[PDB]
Every structure is written in structure tokens, then in C-alpha cells.
Amino acid sequence: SELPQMVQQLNSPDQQELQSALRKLSQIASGGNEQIQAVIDAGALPALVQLLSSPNEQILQEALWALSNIASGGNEQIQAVIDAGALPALVQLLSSPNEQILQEALWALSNIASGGNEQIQAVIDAGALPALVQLLSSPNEQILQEALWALSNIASGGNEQIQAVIDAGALPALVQLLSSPNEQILQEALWALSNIASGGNEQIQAVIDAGALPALVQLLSSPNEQILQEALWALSNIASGGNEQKQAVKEAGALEKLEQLQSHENEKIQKEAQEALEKLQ
């Protein structure tokens, strides 16, 4: 019952009133899907979308936090953000040289792409992929992580969504990231590959053709169980393909490593290695 008044304050020409309202709204939206629905129902979306045109970085940042938090809701709540017309203005911020704005725009986009296939396709259709793929070359590890989240989310969809990621040229950069000494960035690259390889055989074969298998097989020898798990999930997904895909996995030397991992003390590792080994007969 205070929400409608907060939403009206988003138009106040008093920047203190505006910012107080915006900070309250963003944080109510962080409190679960019912609180998100209350913010939507109070009419916040059109005002928040208008704020994506603001040249005031303080307003824009908090507007982005609010939209990100709404987009942490259910798929139809995400769709409300898309229907309010946010995506072009949001995607355009991936050109920003302001790292705070870029980071916050990426979170918002990544959350939208965590929706269902209609929500993901909207992000693709808004033109985000070339930018996201270029940010895989960023020397800023925060930005790089966030781009990998967004891309992983996009690649969590169906085969058409996956294929748009592949067609944007993500695979060579993802495979290059497999040699990173940054264990955080490595695992995010493996997540992206392990979503792409959960597609159909054409998507799996793209992962193979980009040269992922030698690096994944090397990573089966990692002493870091977090890395090993992620590499095993990726390789197991590839092994779920057709006989051409299975053969490529065998040719890369995976069988001998997987046989070794069958008795691993970590149960999650052992189970996925067993499952992978069975897929390959």
C-alpha cells in the first residue's frame, strides 16, 4: 500500500525522493516472487524502463538493480520486463565504457536469459550475442564472468537457442578459456560448454569441431574436484550424442581416465564418471 506512492516518486524532479524510492523498490524486488509481483502490480515497470535512458549513473545503476531483481522471478515476471520494452535499452548498455553500468546491465540480461525459451529468444532477438561474445576477450575478469553467465543462460535453452550462441562464434573463445589459470573463469567456461553440449548432435559436433575434447580430457586429471566435475559434466553431455560423437570422445583418450574415476572418493564425481563410461559402452 506504500508501493504506488514509491512508483510515483520515480518521476519526482527531486532526485532525493526519486533515489529513496528507487532503492526501496529494488530491495523489495529482491525478496521473492510475491514481492516482485507486488512491484509489478504497482506499475513500476514502465517507469523503470524509462530510467534506462537516464544519463544519471546513480539512477541508472539502481534502476538496473531493480530490473535485475524483478528478473530473478518467475518466467512470466521476466516476460513482463521484456513486454515493458526493456531489452533494447539494456542491450545498448553493453557498449558502455563504465564498468559499473556494464556489470549491472549484464546481470540484468543474464537474469532475463535465465527464463524459459521465449525469454531467452527475446534476448537473442534483441541482438545481444555479438557483444556478449566479444566480452569473452575482456581483460576484466568481472565482466568476463558475467558474460559467461549470460551466454551460459542463453545456452540453457533449446537447440535453436544453443545454435544462436554457436552461430555467434562463442566456441573458439570458450575453448581458449579452458587453459585459464583462473579456476573461477575456467568453471564458467565449462558450464557454458556443458550447456551447449546438452543440445542435439549438431550442437555437440560443433563443440567437438572447435577442439574442446583434448582440453576436457586433460581436465579429467585435475586435482580440483570443482573443475573435474564441470569437465565431467561437459564430456558426459558430449557422450550422450550419436555414434560419431561417442567415437570422437573415445579417440581423445577419455575411456582410460573415466575408468580411473569410477572409484573416486567424491560420490558426485564417481557417479558422473560411471554414467559417462556407460554411455560410451
Binding site: 530491495q27 529482491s30 549491472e104 543474464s110 558450464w191 556443458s194
Partner: peptide, 10 residues
């Protein structure tokens, strides 16, 4: 098929 969300909280 693995999705993730990030909230922005103070």
C-alpha cells in the same frame, strides 16, 4: 539446461 540468477542486494 543449467540456469542461474543473481540478485542485487545491499
Amino acid at each position: 539446461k543449467r540456469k542461474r540468477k543473481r540478485k542485487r542486494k545491499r
